[PDB]
C-alpha cells in the first residue's frame, strides 16, 4: 500500500499560494528515497531530519502542502523567513520538521500573454501564524475611511495576480512547491 505522492507532485492543477492545498497522507508505506534521487527538483531542503535516512523514520501524520509561486520566493519557504509569501500566504514555524520540495514549472503554468490564474495575497493587517490559511477576499482598508466593499483609493483588493510570462527571467517564473510536515 504505497502513498499517493503521485496525486500531489504529478497533479495537473496547483492552487494559488494564498489558498494553498493540503493533502493528508497516512496509512501507507512511503518511499522518500525515490524523491531525493530525481534531479528534476531544483530545491530539496529538509529541516530537523536528514535528507538521507528519511525512510528509517515513522510519523503519526504526514501532511503534503502544494501551491505555486515564483523562483525569487522559494527562499521564503523555510523556517524563520520574511517577505510577502512567508508573511501573508504560507508560514512555516521555526521548529519545522520536514522537507520543502520545489521545481521550475515554466512549461505548464506559463502562457503567451501571461498566466494570471495563480494569485497571492498582497495586503494583510498582520502576519500569518504557522500553517495559517487565509482565503478571505475582503477589501483591504488601508485608509481612515471604510470601504464597504468598494475598491478605490485606500481600498484595495487584497489579492494580486502573478502573471507568469515565458519571456521572463528565471526568478519570476512559476515554481511548484510541495511541503512535507512530519508529526513525530
Amino acid at each position, epitope marked *: 500500500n504505497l502513498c499517493p505522492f503521485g496525486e500531489v507532485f504529478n497533479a495537473t492543477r496547483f492552487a494559488s499560494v494564498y489558498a494553498w492545498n493540503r493533502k493528508r497522507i497516512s496509512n501507507c508505506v512511503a518511499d522518500y528515497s525515490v524523491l531525493y534521487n530525481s534531479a528534476s527538483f531544483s530545491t530539496f531542503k529538509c529541516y530537523g531530519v536528514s535528507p538521507t535516512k528519511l525512510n528509517d523514520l515513522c510519523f503519526t501524520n504526514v501532511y503534503a502542502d502544494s501551491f505555486v509561486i515564483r523562483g525569487d520566493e522559494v527562499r521564503q519557504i523555510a523556517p524563520g523567513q520574511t517577505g510577502k509569501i512567508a*508573511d501573508y500566504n504560507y508560514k512555516l514555524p521555526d521548529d519545522f520538521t520536514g522537507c520543502v520540495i520545489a521545481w521550475n514549472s515554466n512549461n505548464l503554468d506559463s502562457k503567451v500573454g501571461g498566466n494570471y490564474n495563480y494569485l497571492y495575497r498582497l495586503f494583510r493587517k498582520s502576519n500569518l501564524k504557522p500553517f495559517e490559511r487565509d482565503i478571505s477576499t475582503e477589501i483591504y482598508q488601508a485608509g481612515s475611511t471604510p470601504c464597504n466593499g468598494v475598491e478605490g483609493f485606500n481600498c484595495y483588493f487584497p489579492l494580486q495576480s502573478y502573471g507568469f510570462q515565458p519571456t*521572463n*527571467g528565471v526568478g519570476y517564473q512559476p515554481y511548484r512547491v510541495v511541503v512535507l510536515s512530519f508529526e513525530l
Partner: antibody
Amino acid sequence: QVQLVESGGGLIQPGGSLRLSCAASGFIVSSNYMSWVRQAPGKGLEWVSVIYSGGSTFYADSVKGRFTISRDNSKNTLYLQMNSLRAEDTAVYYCARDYGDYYFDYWGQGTLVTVSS
Amino acid sequence: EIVLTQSPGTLSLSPGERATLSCRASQSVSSSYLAWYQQKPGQAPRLLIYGASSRATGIPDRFSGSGSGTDFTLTISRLEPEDFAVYYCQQYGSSPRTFGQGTKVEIKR
C-alpha cells in the same frame, strides 16, 4: 485629506544619531507599506528602508545595521532611527507609502539631513 | 543588481513637441515591473506610470509608457510648459528596487 509631513531633519555631527518623523494623515501606517527614500544633492533617488503592514522590515545594503525603521500605531507616525551617520548619508529623506513593496505612489515633502563636521 | 540606464541625459524640446525617454535595464525586468516618476524642480517626486503602461491617478493623458523585457519608454505626446523636469524610471521586478539616474527635459532654444 491624505498627507505626509516629514520632520526631524537637521545638521548632525558625523558618527552621531538622528530620528526622522513622518506624520501621516488619512493613512494608517500600521496598514500600509512605508518606505524611506533618500536623494543626495544633485544625485538620483535611492531606496533606504521599508516596513510591511504586517511588521517585517528590510534595508538597503548601504544602511544595513545602521538604520532602523519603526512605527507608532498610537500616533500614526513613521520613524527612522539613524546611527553612525557619515557624509555619504547626506541627502533629502522622503517618507512615502508604496503599493506593496512595488512602487511609491504617494510621497511626502522631504526633510534635509546634513552630516558634516 | 538590475541597473537602469536612462537616455538621453538631457532632452531639449519646445512646448507641444513629442518627448520620448528611454530606460534600458541590464537584465530582463520580469512582467513589465517598471515605474516612472516626475520630479519638478524643488518638489518631491511624483508617480506617473506604474507597470510600464498603467497610468497613475489623476496624471494627465499626455503621459504614456510602453516597453517589455530590457527596453522601456516614457512618451509625452504634447509637452506642456510644466513638464520640463527630471523623470526617473524605477524597476521592481527583482530586489532590491533601483532607480535610474534621471532624464532632464530642457527647453529648446
